[PDB]
Amino acid sequence: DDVGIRIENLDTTANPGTDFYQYACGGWIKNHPLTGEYSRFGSFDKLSEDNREQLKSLIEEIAGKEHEHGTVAQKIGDLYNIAMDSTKLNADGTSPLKPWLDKIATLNDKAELSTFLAEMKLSGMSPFFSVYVDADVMDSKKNIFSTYQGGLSLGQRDYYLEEDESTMKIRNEFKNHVVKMFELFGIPGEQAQRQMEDVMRIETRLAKSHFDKVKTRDPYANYHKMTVDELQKLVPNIDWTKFLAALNVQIKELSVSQEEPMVEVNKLIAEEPLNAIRSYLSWKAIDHAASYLSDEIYAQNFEFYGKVLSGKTEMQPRWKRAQASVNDCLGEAVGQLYVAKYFPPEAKERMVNLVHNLQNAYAERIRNLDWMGDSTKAKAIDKLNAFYVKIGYPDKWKDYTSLEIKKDSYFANIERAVQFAMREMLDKAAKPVDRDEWYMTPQTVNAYYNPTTNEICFPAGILQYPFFDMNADDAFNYGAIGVVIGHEMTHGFDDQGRQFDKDGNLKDWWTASDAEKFQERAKVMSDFFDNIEVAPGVHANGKFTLGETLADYGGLQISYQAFKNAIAGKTLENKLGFTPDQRFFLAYAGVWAGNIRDEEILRRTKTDPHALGKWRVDGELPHIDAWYQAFGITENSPMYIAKEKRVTIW
């Protein structure tokens, strides 16, 4: 297989035992100058850019030909092309929303809102409040239906309430925007004024009852478990039995994440006349549809949300917005065709085998730890073997048969796609948590171990050069993606992972001895990084970055051990003059190749819990015995530290 590493990345005037990062990556630095718009640019950023061009080219290629009706290619291509057919969008005008606006006008009984609000939810609107289904934070093996404060067009309560002149301007821009939009939908000016006032009055009352975003982030405090009939007593002006039946949700209990905003919804429904409620629901429909109709309507939408609210100066071209629609609403379907082009089953199979080899090597190292007692070692190995390994793309793909894409209107297709997604989410309320369902799409360039689910997810999007190259040999791939995955693996077992059992439920399974001895070993690493000068007269924060430096250490030892196991009994061949062991460490360094501005070095030192790319290499390898052997590092090397001073935590 290919060597994977590239001479253009090296700076071979550097001494490996003096600045290994410079040796392995100095050429990359020289060949990738910062453009001006970025403070940091590394090989992760280069991959993210490469990946967005892959999706653009993929979707255009799919859309350039006709496909068999009902295939994911036909759904992708047709949705893209109907999003792009601006002559039809402009000829159709607002007519695709007429069924919704007519339906809202027939509301004649506040009791009908119970079913109607659920119907709007299924089409992707959230008047008054939001609902969602996800793993119960008190019982990770079960799902729970939750309500959440919502109903605001501006999203944040402060826009409706702060009296400074800057926020007042935003409010008055919103008022003008709502009137202009109603008028674009054929509402006469006098009625558009009156309906805008209804919208502002209602959303301002909702906003007053909301909590700040700071207070809503804790899912354990933003949790109120109760029966359906108890919610029926808390918010009597919605028939929750009908609301839930219209959502096809069959449950006995649910969570009201914030009760006060829900009580305010109850009061709003009681106190506002039905015609003002119709104004608000009509606005929710228009505001949701505003991106999917004519250019005039999109332009007005952008004038407010883009120019006023976001400080943007120019709208994105239609093709970029059409690609976002396809990627955001047919994400996993795009994933199927993405991996068919870029990440074949043999690549998935190689990576799944690699992850299993890392698991086996990690289990071997856990047995030899000198800070973990025997009972804790057994619990750790059992938790590790119970990892949910989600690599490349799903074993269980979403079934898209019930999602129909056809040439009626852009808006009608978006609506069917949202209905499909909402149905799939709400169906989970009745079922136990299914950890084979992917929350990320295959084309995403992100990866993590999740402590609350005990799953490790590495999508095809990140499994590309310089992390993983199907064409490269094991030295390259273990040194690069292998270390990255092993690093994530240690988060099931470190100071964070020890708070969760193998089901993702809260349980502290370390003994007091485990905790004391772990900190004893960890202090070796934090002291070491404390003494690194990341800039003249500026030291690293060894305690703040400890979670990440211990994990890189672990990933290095885990992947190197798995690598030596995988190549056991095979012929070593040097490539580019490097032994396989040397290539392992050169590939590792390349994962962290990067260019960073001087001021960006200072700020990341203040704020970033990850060590800088350079010290993720130069501060980690002096703790790895195998690196000394691979590059002949001796007592006379500036990076050398004595065996008895090296970290031993994994």
The residues of the shown chain that bind Zn ion, judged by CB under 5 A, are 473-475, 551, 580
How many angstroms separate the CA atoms of 624 and 641, rounded?
Answer: 10
How many angstroms separate the CA atoms of 203 and 197, rounded?
Answer: 10
Q: 532: burial class by Cβ within 10 Å (0-12, 13-18, 19+)?
A: middle
DSSP 308: I
Task: Let me know if 552 is a catalytic residue.
Answer: yes
Reduced to 3 states (helix: H, G, I; strand: E, B; else coil), residue 506 is strand
Nearer to Zn ion, 302 or 478 (CB): 478
Nearer to Zn ion, 29 or 481 (CB): 481
Q: 64: burial class by Cβ within 10 Å (0-12, 13-18, 19+)?
A: exposed
Nearer to Zn ion, 329 or 489 (CB): 489
Q: Tell me the closest approach of the beta carbon of residue 526 to Zn ion, in angstroms.
A: 15
Nearer to Zn ion, 433 or 567 (CB): 567
How many angstroms separate the CA atoms of 74 and 91, rounded?
Answer: 24
What the block records as the tokens of 107 is 């509301």
How many angstroms separate the CA atoms of 206 and 264, rounded?
Answer: 7
Evaluate whether 342 touches 55 at the Cβ level (below 8 Å). Answer: no
Q: Tell me the closest approach of the beta carbon of residue 545 to Zn ion, in angstroms.
A: 10
Q: Tell me the closest approach of the beta carbon of residue 491 to Zn ion, in angstroms.
A: 6
Characterise 412 by phi-psi region: left (phi > 0), alpha (psi -120 to 50), beta (else): alpha
Q: Tell me the closest approach of the beta carbon of residue 630 to Zn ion, in angstroms.
A: 13
Evaluate whether 564 touches 495 at the Cβ level (below 8 Å). Answer: no
Q: How many CB atoms lie within 10 A of CB 187?
A: 20
Residues in the chain: 650
Nearer to Zn ion, 116 or 529 (CB): 529
Task: Let me know if 328 is a catalytic residue.
Answer: no
Catalytic residue among 264, 488, 514, 581: 488
Q: Tell me the closest approach of the beta carbon of residue 475 to Zn ion, in angstroms.
A: 4
How many angstroms separate the CA atoms of 640 and 69, rounded?
Answer: 64
Smallest Cα–Cα separation from 423: which of 397, 398, 396? 398
Q: Tell me the closest approach of the beta carbon of residue 480 to Zn ion, in angstroms.
A: 13
Nearer to Zn ion, 121 or 491 (CB): 491
Q: Tell me the closest approach of the beta carbon of residue 102 to Zn ion, in angstroms.
A: 53
Reduced to 3 states (helix: H, G, I; strand: E, B; else coil), residue 144 is strand
What the block records as the tokens of 442 is 């295959």
Nearer to Zn ion, 17 or 580 (CB): 580
Catalytic residue among 19, 552, 581, 620: 552
Q: Which residue type, as a one-letter code, is found at position 129?
A: F
Nearer to Zn ion, 197 or 548 (CB): 548
| All residues at 6 or more sequence positions from 135 whose CB lies less than 8 Å from its CB, including other chains | 141, 142, 143, 144, 433, 452, 453, 504
Q: Tell me the closest approach of the beta carbon of residue 573 to Zn ion, in angstroms.
A: 8
Smallest Cα–Cα separation from 589: which of 7, 8, 22, 1? 22
Q: Which residue type, as a one-letter code, is found at position 96?
A: P
Smallest Cα–Cα separation from 83: which of 62, 105, 111? 62
Q: Which residue type, as a one-letter code, is found at position 467?
A: F
> Which active-site residues does the annotation give?
488, 552
